[model samples]
Target: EITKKYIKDNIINVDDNIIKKKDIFKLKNENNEITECAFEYFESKKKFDDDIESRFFIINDNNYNENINLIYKDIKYCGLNIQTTGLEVFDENIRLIQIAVENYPVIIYDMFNINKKDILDGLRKVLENKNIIKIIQNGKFDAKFLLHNNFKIENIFDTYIASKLLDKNKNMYGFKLNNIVEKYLNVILDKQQQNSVWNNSLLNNNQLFYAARDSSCLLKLYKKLKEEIKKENLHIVNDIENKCILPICDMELNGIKVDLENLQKSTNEILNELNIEKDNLLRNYRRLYKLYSAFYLKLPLHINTKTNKIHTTFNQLKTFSGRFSSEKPNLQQIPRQKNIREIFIPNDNNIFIIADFKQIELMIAAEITNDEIMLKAYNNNIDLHTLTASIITKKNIPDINKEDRHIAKAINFGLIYGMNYVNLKNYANTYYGLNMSLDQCLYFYNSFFEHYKGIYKWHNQVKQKRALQYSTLSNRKVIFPYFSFTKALNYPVQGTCADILKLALVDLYDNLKDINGKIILCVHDEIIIEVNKKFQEEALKILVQSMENSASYFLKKVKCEVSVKIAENWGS
Candidate 1:
């Protein structure tokens, strides 16, 4: 009695459980089977009759910031994403904002019912707050909409980037949010609710459930992947690539402007020139049409008529090698003809600065294999293609003709991918527009490999080491499920080269945040930046410094070089 009185006197207040029952019980009819309900289901059905006390925290204009602050007050990381009308659709309004913090119910803010500006304002503070780290899945879409509305976000973690980093093999596990959730958490989301109209005045149960799960899974995935990647010792690669999500999102949102008028004119000229060629090739009409049809078929259709900008999609993890792939506009595949190159335009006050790695992949091959011949040639500023042609044709490098040099260029580049004679011959004809015979292609391939004994020795070593997988210089793993010499050998060289380039991109992006420039595009080993005329030189220096310094992170003996140019066109 004395102890009870003393404790009661010392305690000012007590916390109580939201539910009266320790375990939630459910009753099944007919079968009469009584079982405990799932925690999520039980919580979903739990409510108090004050009418204000509900299961889910339905944040509105009145309590938007209050609830956000409450959830993220001392939290370091919170899962977040916004549900909008459509993907890749500009002007799609935010319908709901979902956020999940540790040990708290997800706060689903109905932007449709609440004031849009108020919700965004609350979210702006939460996203921009450096103290509260934001976790998201495939944050590109979310960042696109938020950044478009002047919501500045920093300190973000993207599970989608983490998934790709974990599995470099393309299509092994698709990087979709649903796919990731199912693979990692074994929870299958009702994705059909995704098609529901989000802008409706009243949202249905399905829409709310879907939106809730989307953000909730991101929180779970962040914790799960964090542990997994750390276990595999891939935390560095995962974090490095994932941290780039925001910078990449910013570049995608600020899309490149295309000169539609100039593009159409150039297209017409190509068609006319191809028509003349077509008449000459009346012997093979189908072949003639096939040869030139790509020029028209590859043209992007959904060009924004209002702003005249085409938002080309860049996929960071589309390839087994870490190089980026493009879609829709496919700027990477753009023809380099003078007229075709003139289609991409810059802002009135800004200019495009193209910084391309000089023979990056080749240099990577030489560096990894320590090929003295290739390195010596690179150091001597020798024309690699010309030297290759001279060796193959038994002629001096200075005496090799332009046509032969073009053929050698095809072989030199194709060899990086472990191209065989059959494919090499086909590629040579396709690139140089000449039907090179298989016998001649075989001769070139053999002679080139013979000329570089070190490369051949490296290839043999790669084949010998197929049992053990290779790793990038920074320890990013490169595995081969099945034995294939080309992939097993080339993946490390190519993937490491891509990794180095990506590090430079991320560094340059972070460094240029306060500068008068921004990264516009990354096509393989090349990076494009748009800057004001006054800051052009400074940007160039930054680009060069970042590019040259990144190689030291991997390669030691050979130095990687860069070529910078200021051009009005992309292909320039």
Candidate 2:
């Protein structure tokens, strides 16, 4: 265990007198080489003098009151971050909180030593004060943990959200704190200390320095990204994103209850169905694969042992088109099987009110392109897909059969995404299970653009551009680094729909706050809420009006339709 050759080979250069006892390494000389080899375990005295460690100070039981008071009086804005025992706020506890204000020392609060009442009593004022904006990176993560501890954060300036707005392409740059720090501040941050044991009773000097750097760097990032946001005119978009943070935190904290018995029953039914299909090798294999990959591998693992509910992590800036995505048992990708959905139930004495926008993307496209025919059809309560079938087949709208309308539906959505005739043909056959000749696909594609002159003109204009950037109706700007006509046409329609959904969520959250109701889930175009039976009628009214008003804010000519259903479970 104490071989000099091992140290010389592994650690590049080492002193001959180095002694290794158990798991710890001891050096006869005060060499920084060993410290660099294992950062989490070793403390570099030189590092303490060079960076954030110099400005770091600890707040314990004795000085928490005075430090918190100084923060309240002198701080107009501060950098904030928390280190939790784990990622899941519902399952983990916050162990340390770091805050940095301008011209003040970075304060690391020892949560273990401080009393809960004293900590909350002092922090409540600074967190709840709207005038003292809290600069954070990924505000949702910290906000959730704070809310769990009964703190309500207000007026957030999230550099993570700002970075996403400025640079939509995450492949070129990352959103992690170290990434942001290096990009904005031109400093390389060693993050080996990130995975250190945060809940340990005695945190080492390196751990404290890591915590200090995380919060202090946020202030620098906020200053740099604030200017970029203003230059790019993304202030409105950033404001909307930050405004929805607390509401989303509340939704995540109030996770939906799962029907355990129903879940088991559904699992049994799927197994039985798989057993029955064993005779057909291909069919049975497909069914078995679906059962294994989509449900069997994912669903049960997300259930919390303590609460018996699934708390999915929702990300607003994950997708390229500005749509939301979920993970850790992705609720959005729940299988379309009714039995699987039926496993999610409302609380006792409450009902699930599910409301979703009808053909939101199509309506957004019609509005953006000013397609008069599409607008007229929507206004007259006519089915747009049937209208497309009638136009393509040269038949009366009522005479179009289900098969013809299905093909038209494929073409309608496919063309909106800028798919050509060949891709449309394959898409229809693969997804819709419809067989179509190349000639038929080409004829339908040309006929569509011929009939819809507005759409054809818009397509031509987009194709003419070498580079493209567009702003949704809500002023959320998206950039296409490499010009792709398909994405250029697709982003605005889908991005605007995303904006409409977010606006609806904020409005519904405000309206339902005091009505014994809360929004539990948000799929792409749908929102599900749990409410008392008495407020069912009132909630339905608010849901419809809020969605419609939000849609009308963008669509001038096209009309939006919202459909609602009330039941005890989601499947109904």
Reference-based lDDT, each prediction: 0.70, 0.77
Off by over 4 Å in 1: 1-43, 46-55, 62-68, 116-122, 170-174, 267-293, 296-300, 372-454, 468-470
lDDT of 2 by residue, 1-572 (tens): 33333222122112232222222222222333332111111123343333443345565655443423444464689898899888877669888887786655566677876765766555678888889889998899999998897777889999888888888653545888889888888876768877888767656555666777789888878889999998888887788788778768767887888998877777777777777677543666786768766886578888887778888888788888787788876777787778677888988889999998999888888898998898899899889899899899899976889988898899998887788999999999999999989999999899999988889988998888656677788778866668888878888888898888887877787788778678898888989988999998999998898888878777889879999998888888
Clashing pairs in 1: none
TM-score of 2: 0.84
TM-scores, each model vs. reference:
0.78, 0.84
Index of the highest-TM-score prediction: 2
Point to the candidate with the largest lDDT.
Answer: 2
Clashes of each: 0, 0
Error of 2 at 394 (Å): 5.0
